[PDB]
Amino acid sequence: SYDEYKQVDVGKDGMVATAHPLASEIGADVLKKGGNAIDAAVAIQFALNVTEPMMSGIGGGGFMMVYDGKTKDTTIIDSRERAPAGATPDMFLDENGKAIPFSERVTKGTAVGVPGTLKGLEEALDKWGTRSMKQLITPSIKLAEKGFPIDSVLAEAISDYQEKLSRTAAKDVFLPNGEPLKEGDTLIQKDLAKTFKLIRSKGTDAFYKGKFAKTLSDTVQDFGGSMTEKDLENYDITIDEPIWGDYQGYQIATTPPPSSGGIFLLQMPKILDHFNLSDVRSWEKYQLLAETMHLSYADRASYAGDPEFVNVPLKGLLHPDYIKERQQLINLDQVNKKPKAGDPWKYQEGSANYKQVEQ
Template identity: 50%
Template sequence: MGYRRGKSLSNDMEKQSHERETAVGTAGMVVSPHPVATDIGEKILKEGGNAVDAAVAIQFALNVVEPMMTGIGGSGFLMVYDNKKKDVKIYDGHTRAPKGVHPEMFLDDNREVIDFRKRSTHGTAVGIPGILKAMDTALEEHGTKSLADLIQPAIDAAESGVQVNWVLEEALQNFHYRLGKEAKAFYFPEGKPLNEGDSLVKEHLAKTFRILQNKGISAFYEGEIAEAIVANLKEEGGFMTLEDLKNYRLTVDEPIWGEYKGYKIASSAPPSAGGLTVIQILKVLEKFDLSQYDAKSWEKYYLITEAMRLAFADKIAYSGDPEFSDLPIKGLLHDDYIGERAKAVSFERRNDAIDYGNPWKYQEGEPKQVIRQPDDMEKSETTHFTVVDQWGNIAACTSTVEHPFGSGIMVKGYGFLLNNELTDFDANPGGINEAQPDKRPVSCKSPTILFKDDKPVLTLGSPGGPTIIGSVFQTIVNVIDHKMNLKEAIEEPRIFASSGPLIEWEPGISMEAKGEMESKGFEFGDEPSRIGNVQAIQIDHGKGRLYGAADSSREGKAAGITENQIKS
């Protein structure tokens, strides 16, 4: 199980990891990628809080322990299932573009695309952060505890210090080049990187949290925090103004709904392309019935690869912000269109001609010109966590600062990093996802809930940029088609392909099947890599049990609670 960490584990350590990463509960469950965050969420549930209360506390905690993945300078999609109303909503705290952006912002004087590392660590990469607004709005509508109380555990952790774990150590080793001057000084004290086991005290971040605790989330969008953000970005050549921050708009969205083998699926809606693409892939796979193939067979790998390539070709062509463009959502999920796309899968070899289709045949509207983009982006990182409470409510959140450490710009004196999410806009202008003021770039975040007989039975999500989609749908088919338990479904080695021939792969996939795939024209990366970090909860209504599982690719923890642990 520990192979994905790049470290071999002793049997005792492997057993401890498995015990930390799995849990059973009857009255609540928390799963997050870090033990400190999970413990904080568990404490909130035991104190009688609900899923949204716990999610807010976890998000603040993850800013302390997973700063390279998420934080108040970033964005996120928070999916909430209200069990009383039987209703699912998405609090879309996705970043928006400042008024100063323009479609050619990522081109140099020669109209060539600026190198990704350069454009993603510049002030112009930073979008208006929305995760705090999402958390605040969800708390207002669903929460039972005060924001001040939910921030306090993260303040305690920041002030007392948290241990650097192997995930942060590895991120500092691999992505130090993304850190700006302020962040470099903090994470490389006296020029030396922090190592696993070092204690990290975050006084400036605690100060920022105390301001939010006393003045509310509006203090981030107006006042001294906002002024510090704008001043820092001005020094870095950014566009953002105080007016941009003050005018940030959150939307509360309906999910995208789909079906797979008798399960209803609710997932993220545009401007995230994640949910739509997950459902489109599953609809293509349903035409072939994956359950007849072994989980490690070449036929399974072949089908999921071609389904991904078809859906990603469409995603690249037709994803955008629905406030700015009509999107062919109905057409992309139309049964006749899915049938048409599925005909591209032959089993004989890789289909060299896979490209985007024409979903506009199946709905009214006008397609926009498709502009090809450079394939120079590095893999982004994010985080996902999920909670079920004693009342059956669910919160599932995927939040991010985009690439590891975001833009690398740390707000001086306030201890948090700013995102680089505007690099999710097209670098080459003219398409549906070009940069425009107040627009939201395309995302792949896919917080997802599955229902059976109108009852929620599984909630999951993952980080990983485009690979989020691959991680989420593969976990779903492992549970439904291959009848794996939740931990097995998460740990089963994954593969990922976008629209091209190259396949990313994790250690543990069948080498025999890999060879068969290569004989059919597929190309595999030279080395395996980690793909995603799934956190999930399964709900067994018959047994009254909750099963939580965290992915071993980080230091995740699942915590289940029982009725007698909840304070009355």
Template identity: 40%
Template sequence: MRILSLALWVLLSFSVAAEAPQKAAIASAHPMATAAGHKILSQGGNAFDAAIAVSSTLAVVEQQSSGIGGGAFWLLHRAKDGKNIMIDGREEAPAAAYADMYLDENGDVNRDLALYGPLAAAIPGEIAGFEHLAKYYGKLPLSVSLQPAIEAAEKGFPAYPRIIKTIERKAKVLKRYPASAAIYFPDGEVPKEGELIIQKDLAKTLKAVAKHGKAGFYEGKVAKKMVKAVQKHGGIWTLDDLKNYTVKEREPITTNYRGHQLVTAAPPSSGGIAIATILNILSAWDLTALKNDGNSPKRIHLITEAMRRAYRDRSIYLGDTDFVEVPIQLLTHPYYAAGLRAGINPTKAMPSELLPGINDNPKGEDTTHFSIIDTEGNLVSATLTVNTGLASGFIADGTGVLLNNEMDDFSAKPGEPNAFGLIGDDANKIEPGKRPLSSMSPTFVFSEDKVAVLGTPGGSRIITMVLLGLLDYFDGNDVHSWVNKPRYHHQYLPDKLYIEKGAFDAATIEALKAKGHEVVEHRGHWGNMHAVSWNKKTGEVDAASDPRTTTGSATVK
């Protein structure tokens, strides 16, 4: 699965490198971030420089979803040599972390400790990723690419409904910590729409990075302030934890589906393996024909059963490959998928409890994504996170850095669900220096005449949202259709088929129930997909942002 034939690889690499897009396209969650990326391109930067500008600006203006106190996966395609690589800036557990650190005296998970305050924070990786991108892939100095973010933090950005609602939801946690309250409750009140949110300390931290690179964050004054604040409020970070953090380059997961090559995220993301597994299972059926024949319930049923099996494997096998042996070649092999497919009844749902695996029944959309194509044909698909909305709620005094709560993405106890309802086993247990399993799934699709770049936030639903966007692409639809696609989701446990409000008509829902699915209609919508495409025959590029949120920005210049 992961090893393409030499002829196909040469064809695809040559096709992408031999032609160039007419314009650059960027789609992100906020117009200031999209504009920052285009500004850096206009100054002679490439897609990788623009990725730094977009990432760092989102870290200022969309802190409910990402930040320099969090981490990211940047999936890159370099046009000049066809190289695909994943930059792993995922957070990692501090050296003092241990498997049972969030269990109370009864052996139950203390969810407050796992989610709120500095004990919930893993060591951030985003800044290390910025330096790596600039040093090995970009054209411009890091200081240039960070300038739009510095200005946004220093001058402020207008508060908008999504961040206001997140501040309101998390008010009790944010008010625990003076530095957080000072930013998010100026004059003691939640910012009103249009009111500027100004972050002077964050601007100073970004300036330190612009001047000193990674060392400006992981060493020196900023590091000392962060560690002092963390330890004061019950956290376990040390200066050595910060100094020892390193970004990693990972070989992406590659797979083929209906004449297309997919390049997607590798562990510690679970997304690439899960997507490859699902597509391999589904390859035996002509899903487009089912859709065109009006047999949507059967198509949805088959896709749901494939989701169920991939998420079951996620819960058992997947973790940080630096710590556990993940059977990647097995899980992404067509023969393995054929075995999973053999257990699918085309007319009846299989209860998850009948699949071998973790059988404990467990009792958000707070990440961000952007996609870039530049005029050289370089590609970036990046998903960034601090985990839940406004993360741990803890800003380290004097730094402006909002710390993640990614420790909750580990399995705090086998079979116990995390904040997104995902369960895990020993492969994803807490260990010092280990990176928690993620669902982030930045993805490229290559064919002879087209290129697609897509991804989305959405917690446990990221994988299935990217999958549905891909299937819509394979059906022949354009980038605007992928991001608009109605969404549904099954994650093995709990054994329920979740759907967006209004995604299916009443007849389809009844047909799925008749097949044995417990259909749960969500009260609203989820996800925030941002995608770009390139027609290599015409040179035209296109970009689209999810209409489910009001701040998405997709532009072609």
């Protein structure tokens, strides 16, 4: 029963924490049976792909931060999707051209990035693995082939996203006679189980090459996207270096661009430091949190993108004198009705290769 699982646990040998009890059981088993943390993480991604299918897996991408017990280096396997070679800067504009409404946009072939998750898993095992992808994918093959009982969150997702599912082959799996599967119903994913078995036998070429690659491509085009078999062939991950900040005697290792998150995770506490946060439910605390967010999120919209393509002013965004400028904009009792991006370029060299454009 899902009811019987912990949200706080302890161990002396090991710890797993994931958003699905069956993925947690699988990762913990790998640790039980003498796997490392990387082995267990790779097993977990495949399990989540089956048991929390609306949230991640081999159709997507991610950022896997790994501290290596051996080397003491922290690195990031960045499996973020790439736009196909056929993508264009105005692909989400209609004929006029203004923006195809979000909720339609989501839903189009042009939205599909070349998936990286599986390439990332292969990379992680190559670097740190002590168990084969064959061993690690097997528990998920069983969950896909044989079923498990859907939890409340997946149940609500199927219900909430019924229209979008309707629309596509996904309906055969999640809507299986025109009705949404309900909490506690068995979800069987025969085709996904077959895809995982192909990966088990042939390796990742089962996904990035031959007959699956052809069908993934054909499908995206049929929905209006440009993705090609060559796009899939071309895909590789990147190894990213964490960006670091000092915080209250700790060091924060976090993810650089193409994540926007790391820079502003570092920037916000630098801005907040001046104000000494520190009653937990006072209006003061929430006010300072909100004002700071307004500033950092404005900088995010102006200055962040893929660093292979654009000059992100990292140095300049987390320069002390820049932090001071931003801190000066924040007042305990009033609110800045007009929060805007600062000018981090004052504090570093070079210049932006991109314009400021309203969205």
